[model samples]
Target chain A: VIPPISCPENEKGEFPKNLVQIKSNRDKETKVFYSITGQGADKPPVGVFIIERETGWLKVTQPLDREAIAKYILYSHAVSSNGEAVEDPMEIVITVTDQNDNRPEFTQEVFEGSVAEGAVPGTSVMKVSATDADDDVNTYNAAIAYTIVSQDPELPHKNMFTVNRDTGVISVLTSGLDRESYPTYTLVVQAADLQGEGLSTTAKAVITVKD
Target chain B: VIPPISCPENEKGEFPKNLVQIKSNRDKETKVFYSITGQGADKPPVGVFIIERETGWLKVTQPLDREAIAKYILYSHAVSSNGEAVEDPMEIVITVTDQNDNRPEFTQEVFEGSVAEGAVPGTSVMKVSATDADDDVNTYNAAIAYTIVSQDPELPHKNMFTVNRDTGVISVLTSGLDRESYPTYTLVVQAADLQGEGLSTTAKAVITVKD
Candidate 1:
């Protein structure tokens, strides 16, 4: 017996590639035809997935996005040239794994926040959040981390601010959040996966020091 | 006329929020009601977008990812408390913008590459490719960059290899490869988006030194 087909999601615009092969256990002289029926085959967002009616070879015509639909369940059947059913319909499942093809995007171009000038180090200033279009699994592929890569005015200390790796919460790293030396600070915060080990994107955080 | 609703894609499991409000031309005492019909309302992956039948308020039940279905088209209609049509059904289009939430994934966990011993410094070793699920526009959000993060053993030189920033092409930086000293070298390569300004991911490359 032939095993069911398991296909992975492909990038958009990728050329057509062989996805699976279906065979019928009928006599050699009898011609067999293959057809697919299911969500991706004949449903909304259709025509992206197709099968060779004669050869029973299934292939995807365009790139696939897992975010749209993680998996597709399809049913295939084989029929003889004379229109006789050679075998019952079989099931095929396709899974779409997560890929690092997206960048974290902040809801706003610049995040505005405020904090007391004399606040001690580690005082929470503001929390920044970004949304990603990729899968939202707990694994490294979708897990996001935040970091302050650079500061606008390297005044009191180069490392004047700190951010929670997982939370994207910005905090004071030095005691000198003075309105005199600097009334405001512009920091570049980066959000990435793999605890900052993988793909990353940056946003601006503007903090105004209050006296 | 009431403005078209523009709702950003929400992350999954997010608290429900009002997306838009539909107002009928009738007066306040008309007791207008709202209803929606279409892809996100009564289709597969259902119950995501809904509306308040009494208040004519529309809301999304959970988070949304544009990669799955970038936009949703819905038909909205207003009815009186007595089940009478107040206005013709209006078309509501909800567009989901791009977000960098995906991490670049290597085609393989361990990339197997080879190079000859005592090769020139500028020898091409291998080319690695990763598939990202983000939009393929010519922008920093999906622009991928490659860099060699670390080498297992810093033998003759601290920098033994270099990778192209634009392409994932690896080359020999210092030609001191000796099979007797180091038969195989494992290197860590990284792929990042936003031209390295945003998210990033890493992969392993094993290069065998031939005699």
Candidate 2:
């Protein structure tokens, strides 16, 4: 009779390329623990990237940003038939895959860049800013535009500040200038992607005027 | 008809401290939000801290650690008559209340400390460490201790690791250590209070001897 073995194929002490594999359509109801690499260190562990243990299928679950992680190592004590201790060394490598769960986050909720309170109706007030997370066309998410959703009548730039959609530059579009007319104006600046119709986020800017 | 113009507590600019105070017996249940002053910046919005709608007795259904945290701030806020924001600048100080839910936790699941091989008796082998969350003496709930649960026969100091119950220092009482004879040792370290009672935690440590 053959001896009980741990690995199905352990011919030359080298691991098989396919630690485990299965078809995605093979099982509908099953639970798997994706093996990972680099547990002890700050990096993620190396093992099956994401395991469907019962089916032996592996998939990547981490976002594309974590492309730097490579492998994980584990240690164990070895024992021989003569009842002597043997040295044990084993390591696992993890490959990364990508997904689109990440959205661009703002550096600050209330961006506080300033402009003179009163120069003229169409006076350059402040520049708008935004950032995006995805690559290429995804960068479109970073494009910003400015507008005065609501303005007080006493404000000189009641309908003053306008924006360049592609450039994110806020400039004065009107000619009414009076330091006493209005000192400060609050504008609601919005950022959105050309591709993302309804997925845009917004920020606010408060402009100050001087005599 | 009551006079429309009477002594108006609100119009007179009189602020009341307790707008709604329904007193009940000492056994009466109350619902309140207990908060800490300094750490309150992270407290959950109204929903994070809750009291039973009618009873104020507090229990943290959410995850909390008395050890990692020391004190917190508390404050009460509500909408005003004109729907203006009421910012209560005065925050109450909240000291953590201790409970027995948390046991001592180890920094690492498997601790690895080193020792030199062929060492004589009375050499330091390793140190055990753990932390408790309870207050005062309760803070020492899991003072760690080390023990050589098992060892190879060829190793001279088999079960020779003696640990200080209170200090968690594991010293070699009898040492004739040989790396080949015993390159590594597995220990089961237990963490219990100085009183040797209450909920305890156990961990594993692998001590390796350098040749």
Candidate 3:
């Protein structure tokens, strides 16, 4: 078992010397014992890194985001046949690579909505859309949690309608509607992600309901 | 105007010599007329035949169906001016096309429903299905109405199930199920479409529930 070690920093940006040197006391083939860690203490940590069996080359399988995840600690143990922990007589260092998780955000944060004359309620007059760049759960992400963030208390559809939490589909639940009396509705929508608890970045969409 | 004479019996299938002798007479800005008489009014009574404008096709537009109508008498004034009745006449011969309004039937005239071990009554364990061939009213024309044709009085709660006459969603109303006591229940589902009062066809669905 060999714990991962980093190469020391060099002024010339070159590979550090002899930090991870392997000296086999026996003339037998070198065998590696490996394990990975991430998010939780669950065994195997759902594929955080992969290590080559024959070569000591290490690869990051699922990239980690510093914005979404503070840091990932990989603890490796290198030992000999009698199960003795190997010591680093020569000092070695390791570092993690940066990744893109938080996406580019829009300038104007708030969005507004409007409706035309004789527009029907709950008919999906308009929709809100946002984009993400993280791969897997982080990339091409789609989720909508709509609440009347701000609205006139006297609005008719205030309690008459609601937007879908995931789809942003607006629907009218209660019945009192007179297009002539209340011709339009203005609404504000906010978009976010499960990662970083949505603190990383966000976007907004403007909507218009035609009569 | 000189009224055209009826075609002689010797030339029954032939148009009168003077009848519509001018081809353009049936065109726009022109008109022609003819008449016929043979069987009694109760039998196959005959009268004048005319080709319409634009379409110039032969049809008995004035006289209606005769089966439900008696004396089948019609007086059609062919002249453009309404000064006086032309004493002109025409006959109506109609044939209506048949549709697949009649639904196809199943060999097993009746269907039965049963529940196996560990089934919660009132649960929609199974749904009955049927199909129709008519275009417009397939749901209506071929819609099957379900009814409980027979029941076992000794089996309490035997009639605890209800099937939607249209969707055939069978639901049990009463509980109290013991696999050893009432593991199986046989119910008859009869379907008749058109509000359950029109021509209908029926099929059966065998339901056996499991835990």
Candidate 4:
């Protein structure tokens, strides 16, 4: 029967070589075979991980990408020569740790927010949203923070608006918004995925002043 | 100055006529102007609700369709001829109640699921999802419930599976699946949005039994 294998986790960007060895304490007379099933080995995106059916040595065929898939759930089983089960199917969990390879992606390429003319400060102008396609469980790779990078035709103040770093809510920080003087304002909003220290992306928000 | 109007909620399919009156408490002493704004009256789907500026009478110009729009949020404002605001802009909330006018719509017309022949009982086969366009806030108009209306070529057992009422997950209820005996099974799944009592839609699910 095949013997079950216990594998240890490996990091990404490893060479295509032997990663682990599966051993059995069964009597030398008793023959055992080993095989693996499920993700990364038997399913789609297959052949990334391989095993020697005779010796139960596992090998990593390629470097891992945590951005593509965070982890894999696999199963290893053992059987005898007569096709009888030698041991229970053992669960294999392969975890791919974090690497800042993905940037924040805004839900929309552009955002539109409006504020009536003569509105007071603290009025909600607009809100922008974003998402990151990276592993967030172990690292803050997906935790996003927003900022107003630029504004067109600087008005009463260079920074006339404020954005909530965490919630992405943009509000008018200064008063005196007159439709006759300024009909519209353009803002460039940026979203950073790693607490504003990692890769980031920008989106446009057009705020219209209405009477 | 003109006074705000409190209108009665109307049901679907009602005759178009005067719905409410806008009157000023100051009467003839003060010259008041009446106007309406916001959804159903000033925005898209306009002209459904109309108001006479001189008479201060509001009327519904078209029959109401709960399916198209359940309610209208319209604002009534008053201003004096002297260019002075008589009252601040007030917020109006119109709630649309539920009606059995919409049927549940499945995301896909046909669902495909597979199960290994000899799979044990309680094995999850597949999940079906659906959405309703009716108003689900006030009532359970869009609260869907699923059921297996019929199973083609019932074998092994008349009821070979069970479905989760809320989540729409179908699982194997009885074991002993034989690919030779039943190669495939066609199930008529019904999605009822109104708590299994209102309008419903049916879709087909094909479950293939593979060795």
Q: For each candidate, what is the lDDT?
A: 0.75, 0.44, 0.40, 0.72
- Report per-candidate TM-score of chain A alone: 0.83, 0.49, 0.39, 0.83
DockQ of each: 0.05, 0.01, 0.00, 0.01
* Model 1 Cα lDDT, one tens digit per residue, A1-211: 2333333343444457666666776748698998888888888667767889888887877766777777888778888889898889888776654554565677677999999898889899999887777667523446688888889888876887898888888998887778888888899888876456666678899999898
On the 0 to 100 scale, the lDDT of residue A106 in model 2 is 42
Per-residue accuracy of model 3 over A131-206 as CA lDDT, tens digit each: 5443223222222244434433335546555566566555554555456666545555555543222312343444
Chain A TM value for model 4: 0.83
* Candidate 4 lDDT score at position B3: 21
Best prediction by TM-score: 1
Q: Candidate 2 vs candidate 3: which has greater lDDT?
A: 2
Clashes of each: 22, 32, 17, 5
lDDT of 4 by residue, B71-176 (tens): 6778777677876657665444443333334568999999999999888989999998889986565345577999999888788778887788889999998987
Best by lDDT: 1
Q: Higher DockQ: candidate 1 or 2?
A: 1
Worst 10 residues of 2 chain A by lDDT: A1-10
The 10 consecutive residues of candidate 4 chain B with the worst lDDT sum are B1-10
| Model 3: fnat (fraction of native contacts) | 0.00
Each candidate's fnat: 0.09, 0.00, 0.00, 0.00
lDDT of 3 by residue, B7-93 (tens): 111111224222222122322444433323323222354433444433324333232222223232322334433333234445432
